[PDB]
């Protein structure tokens, strides 16, 4: 029991942010009306977290997966709780995963979506002002404000776990 | 010749090759701040020379 209690603070600190990730997962699934699916309903089976081994301290064209599941719904996969936890966990928290790899795809999608939205909305503008407005939309300040007003930064995992020094037990 | 582990060998040599004044000082230091938070302690040592 002493050996098992040695690991207790780490387990509790992971459970904290796993519960935050579950909250985010359920909230986003419900907002998309996808919460009634067999995958995402009461029968959700969370897959175990996966080690991101890329981290430093750890004839024919193949169809693209995201586009494959964009047009056909049979390839839709449940949004994993571990994936949301990785999205929340910053690199400063010296955990075994971070938000870096997801951020690349998220940034690319945000840029593409803002570009198409502005092009469809303001089709009678020159390229210069469209580029400027897009740079404003995807700027750090805009994303910062529009995530602060979503009450997300109160649930982020961004500090290294030093239980003895900067941690308050339950 | 006592052992090969240097980390405890330093403690051993310090404990053997010091007068009981230094030994008792170090032991009182160890038992005073065994596993505490460095921000939780603030101490002074007054010596003459």
């Amino acid at each position: 029991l002493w050996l098992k209690l040695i690991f207790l603070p780490s387990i509790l600190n992971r459970m904290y942010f796993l519960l935050h990730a579950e909250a985010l997962r359920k909230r986003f699934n419900t907002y998309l009306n996808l919460h009634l699916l067999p995958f995402n309903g009461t029968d959700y089976m969370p897959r175990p977290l996966e080690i991101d081994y890329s981290l430093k301290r750890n004839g024919k064209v193949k169809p693209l997966l995201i586009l494959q599941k964009t047009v056909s719904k049979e390839h839709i996969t449940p949004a994993e709780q571990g994936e949301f936890l990785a999205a929340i966990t910053a690199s400063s928290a010296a955990d075994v995963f971070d938000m870096e790899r997801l951020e690349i795809l998220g940034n690319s999608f945000l840029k593409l979506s803002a570009t198409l939205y502005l092009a469809s909305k303001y089709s009678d503008w020159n390229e210069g002002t469209l580029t400027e407005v897009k740079s404003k939309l995807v700027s750090n300040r805009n994303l910062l404000f529009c995530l602060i007003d979503a009450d997300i930064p109160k649930t982020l995992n961004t500090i290294q776990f030093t239980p003895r020094y900067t941690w308050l037990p339950p | 010749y006592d052992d090969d582990d240097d980390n405890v060998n330093t403690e051993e040599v310090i404990m053997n090759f010091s007068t009981p004044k230094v030994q008792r000082f170090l032991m009182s230091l160890k038992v005073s701040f065994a596993d505490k938070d460095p921000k939780d302690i603030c101490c002074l040592v007054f010596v003459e020379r």
Partner: protein, 49 residues
């Protein structure tokens, strides 16, 4: 990564990054219109060729 672009477009409505409208929903950005006065759809293809 989990739901494709069509569902991911709705998230920008959640974060208020892209303001929605009755005429152009966010789910239909894949239906981009190269509209405006800059295009002339009545021109016969011989002039282009």
């Amino acid at each position: 990564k989990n739901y494709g672009l069509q569902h991911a477009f709705k998230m920008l409505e959640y974060f208020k990054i892209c303001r929605a409208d009755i005429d152009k929903p966010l789910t239909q950005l894949l239906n981009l219109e190269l509209g405006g006065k800059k295009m002339r759809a009545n021109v016969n293809t011989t002039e282009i060729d």
